[PDB]
Amino acid sequence: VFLYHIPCDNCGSSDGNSLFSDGHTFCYVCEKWTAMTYNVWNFGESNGRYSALTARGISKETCQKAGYWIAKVDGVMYQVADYRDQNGNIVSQKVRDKDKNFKTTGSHKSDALFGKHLWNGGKKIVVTEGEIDMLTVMELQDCKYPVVSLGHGASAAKKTCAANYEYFDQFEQIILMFDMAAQVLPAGKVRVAVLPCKDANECHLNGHDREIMEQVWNAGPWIPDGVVSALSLRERIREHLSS
Amino acid sequence: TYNVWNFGESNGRYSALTARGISKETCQKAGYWIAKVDGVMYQVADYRDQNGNIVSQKVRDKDKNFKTTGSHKSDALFGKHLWNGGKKIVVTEGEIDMLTVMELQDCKYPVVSLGHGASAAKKTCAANYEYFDQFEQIILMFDMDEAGRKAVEEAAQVLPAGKVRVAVLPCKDANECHLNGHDREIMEQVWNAGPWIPDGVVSALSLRERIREHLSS
Amino acid sequence: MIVSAIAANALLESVTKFHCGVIYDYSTAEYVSYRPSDFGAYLDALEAEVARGGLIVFHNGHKYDVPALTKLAKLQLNREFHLPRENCIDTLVLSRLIHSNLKDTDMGLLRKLPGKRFGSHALEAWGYRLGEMKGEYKDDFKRMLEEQGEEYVDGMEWWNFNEEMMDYNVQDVVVTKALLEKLLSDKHYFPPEIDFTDVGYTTFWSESLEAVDIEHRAAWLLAKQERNGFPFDTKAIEELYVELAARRSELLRKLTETFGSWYQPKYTPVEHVVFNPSSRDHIQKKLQEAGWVPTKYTDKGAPVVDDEVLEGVRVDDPEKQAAIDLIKEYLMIQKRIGQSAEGDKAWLRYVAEDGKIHGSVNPNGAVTGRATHAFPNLAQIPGVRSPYGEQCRAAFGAEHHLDGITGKPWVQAGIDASGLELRCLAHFMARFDNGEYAHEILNGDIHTKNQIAAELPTRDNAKTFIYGFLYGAGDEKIGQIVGAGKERGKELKKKFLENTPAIAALRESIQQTLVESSQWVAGEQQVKWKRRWIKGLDGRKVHVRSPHAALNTLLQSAGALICKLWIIKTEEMLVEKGLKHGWDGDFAYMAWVHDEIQVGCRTEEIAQVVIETAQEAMRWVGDHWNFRCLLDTEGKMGPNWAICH
RNA sequence: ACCAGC
Ligand SMILES: Cc1cn([C@H]2C[C@H](O)[C@@H](COP(=O)(O)OP(=O)(O)OP(=O)(O)O)O2)c(=O)[nH]c1=O
Ligand SMILES: [Mg+2]
Ligand SMILES: [Mg+2]
């Protein structure tokens, strides 16, 4: 948190350097900052470089915050995604490539989530099924709103969401972005929105990204099952009338 | 895992509990203390037998984990060795509740605690039938939760009838009523508790309001 | 006169429980303590000290401490408890006027303070400055829990009562008393012919200066309008965020294909870095390698890049000529987003449960008596001339408060003063030119005819130019207002100096009053001072930072005080007229930015009464201090704060 | 360093 201004030393400014409560300083003029396998891939070993993805659209600070880094081991390009805990320690990894040959290292639990080590308090949460849609929502919202994502696919919705119950209980409105379903969450709290494409990335790469953000802040309530009311049939009662 | 941790080889110290509401005299009386192993301060509770010999340690960290150092029996209670009789006991659910109750009475009534809690209370009460025979009244003091009501409902079956009384609390358990200044309610629930009323049976006299409102709608 | 100190469980927003309180007295010398069960006795002691005609000394008592007692005495034991404002005094409101300059004298002491307490008016910082501090409650409690082994959860240690809380509360009231003795040991504000520890509320207020009374009334009223809040619309700003967050995600897609990426040196290690338009290095590089010469070097090796050089820029490629406008629009949208919704101190992170925004207002934060606004700043939202300005001020309305008894929205009235510092200038120099300047200001509008005389395009540009010329500019910074050179920057100075030849005489009078000698250094300035301070309109020692800003600290420090008395008198007439302040009455103050006021009321007739009595309050301010000018305001009526600007 | 406010 910002406290006050001290005079900088490298650039020699008067009110450029700002002091903070965390102990670090920052100057706005000279821009100088002060201060399976069962094997976790070390960052200094696997040649970790935080490169950007051009064909989908992901900045570099998003990969630095979320921990989605490209390894250059074995002369090829791997995309290691890291899973952490509530204390902030490396638990498991995912090494994904062009042939999708998954190499899940470490202790991969049944209730692991991607992006739960930075975001613990808030009001709204957006939950996706993969990792690229999670990075897409973080790119749209500039990495400042709580978005988590599953780690076992859309088939473990009865296991992953059910085991993490006190984690999702702290939030006021849980918004789902699985497929365009689970009821283990407490009622009167779950919102599910509808998008015109397969996922969020096909809306981002085709101009429908505005319709992503309109479905986040005004998501409709969750109808529980295949029961319907007597008003949403109004066109179909017409349609069978014209058959 | 290894053995009973001695306080000298683990830098033990009998002190108070500021954030819980327990002074150092009650912790000196019971035997709840703090060791310094592996850098992080670890709290530890002591289990004794009926004679008074140390049989087990129970080590808790700063993030609420459990650790048994050895053979964990079912006939071992936390706070049992100090008393060998009396006329009124109060049985708790956790382990800090025993310190909470003995803090506010200056060690006048026998208070025991369970070694498993509410999950395996029937097993540790079925093997402890013979210890509660020398007593005159039993006051069960469990949580005001679903698991607490289920444990106080299912644990009163193996006990002797006519002596088991159940008390209610406005808090979660005794510790929040100790913190929030509700020291006048817990001293009445020990001396004057609720009698037998198992769920399922309803007396014909105490049903006036439900029959009054039932023929109205 | 008693000195009381409280300790409760949380902040004034959500407080439900009393923990402890200590009272010291100046007639018995007794640290009368209290317990959690003695709250009725605490209130009875305070009501006895009120009823005998005394003064209760708190610290930060107007903002937090007294409404905390009024809330707890209601919602814990069901009894009304109100302290009259002429009995409660504060030792923070006194510190912010007596020691109004800590950042310029606190160095040389930082050897005492830790470093986080540099220039703080908090009560612990004065414990470090008075060399009377025995520990701290939070650090010792954290060290205690780490010694026991149980975790330290949330930094919330006022949950449960204990005995260390009473001890640090006793040390708290010791620090408050040792601060009060030094604050009453001043001679310019409190004359040393009477002892101020046994006088009543008719002697302490009216046997001293007026600056000690107006500041406490201002702190009372500004704490009340902080407790009122500002009504805010959330859906109409979420629509704006979802609108212009799908525009900066098009202004980067359309722009990175124009400005390509490049390899930048990190055997030579390179990296594939792309164009980031928010940086002012990437645009500087890409304009350096596309055929543009800056011809303006503020930095010693780098140009200056802002909105006034991104207009006057020409390149050879006709695609980049259109791309620069998209770069400027992207910077605007980025600043709009970071202010409105994505910042750490954004609008949508300070909305309460009842749909209102509560912002802190420091009544004396500047050295010239000007109020500062913080957490968030409601004096820094974009005006109606900037793009996306009306859509940001239309959410900050007073018609978003539907009434709690009839279900109807309210009406807003906004009152602004006209020509404030420019008319204070005609007050101060009317003894030189015999008052033939304060007649043209009263004869028609001043800024419109100044725009006619100086052929400026807009009234806002004429208004910027006149104060730029008046508060000691250079040769170029008032030619830059029209964009011309220093020739026009010289001839405008000569034209507006040869009209009334009294500004230079007034400046020479100020120089002969304050400074006596100023030695010249080729890179600095060494000045022997004679009087570093200036007597204001009510005897307050206004501090002077630099000898070329003396006209500034003479004009704005005398211009802020007339508004500070005006905002007090325009409710002292309304309460005495037979209305009620608050949301459950007939009117409520909402915000006080540096010149104008924003009040929200229930009916249009109450709006007309307020907009009438503001003129009478301003005229009474102009009569109380014997100004040589004639003060006048202007009011508007509307639903929100876009018509009432 | 840039923006915004009076
Ligand atoms: C614009 C501006 C105003 N001021 C002063 C002038 C006023 O005393 C006060 C507020 O300025 P304004 O309210 O903007 O100007 P004004 O009150 O003279 O004119 P009007 O209300 O009729 O439109 O701050 C500055 O010091 N610097 C500035 O750049
Ligand atoms: Mg205080
Ligand atoms: Mg004005």
Ligand SMILES: [Zn+2]
């Ligand atoms: Zn610097």
